[PDB]
């Protein structure tokens, strides 16, 4: 194998508390709790001086990849209860200006390409949507929920029948939690 005792360690920040009981990891910060099940045979999680330790005793490549995936997830949970996440969206239109509204657990888009029928997009529990001019912001603590809400809003505007070079109207992502999108 690669090595004999692969061991990853995450240091806890100022005001965060990590509980580990029964394949379930729980994180508390200034804002909200967060839970997550992380299980794989041979992989253990516990707490040290301040640290969260993930550890396996004679790993293979795939096991290494899994240990580091789990580490990534815990770090995102911690950064999220510490600060949070925010995504950014932009609206473009050639003809037919579309009105975007937030009402309940759905975003409503109307006058898209001239359609009489409105399109709808789900908002997952614990995520806030704001609309400022031609721009939408999706902010919260759970990275997966935030990204999923944003992807819902972007797929609510999809075209299969006509050439997308000419027909480009829609809502698009421009920034995921800081890193901007570029071609």
């Amino acid at each position: 194998p690669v090595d004999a005792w692969i061991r990853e360690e995450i240091e806890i920040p100022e005001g965060v508390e990590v509980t580990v009981e029964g394949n379930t990891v729980k994180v508390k910060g200034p804002k909200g709790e967060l839970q997550r099940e992380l299980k794989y045979p041979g992989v253990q999680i516990f707490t040290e001086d301040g640290k969260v330790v993930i550890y396996k005793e004679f790993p293979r490549k795939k096991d290494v990849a899994i240990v580091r995936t789990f580490k990534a997830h815990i770090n995102n949970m911690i950064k999220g209860v510490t600060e949070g996440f925010k995504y950014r969206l932009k609206v473009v239109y050639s003809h037919f200006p579309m009105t975007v509204k937030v009402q309940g657990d759905e975003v409503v888009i109307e006058n898209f390409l001239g359609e009489k029928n409105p399109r709808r997009a789900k908002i997952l529990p614990g995520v806030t949507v704001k609309v400022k001019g031609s721009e939408i912001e999706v902010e919260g603590i759970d990275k997966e929920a935030v990204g999923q809400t944003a992807a819902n809003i972007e797929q609510a505007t999809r075209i299969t029948k006509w050439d997308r070079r000419v027909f480009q109207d829609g809502i698009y992502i421009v920034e995921k939690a800081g890193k901007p999108i570029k071609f």
Binding site: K90, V92, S94, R164, V166, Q168, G170, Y172, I173, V174, I181, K182, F183
Partner: peptide
């Protein structure tokens, strides 16, 4: 009707 915001996610394949 160019919209690079849209091109960056339509044509990155």
């Amino acid at each position: 009707a160019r919209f690079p915001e849209a091109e960056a996610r339509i044509f990155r394949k």
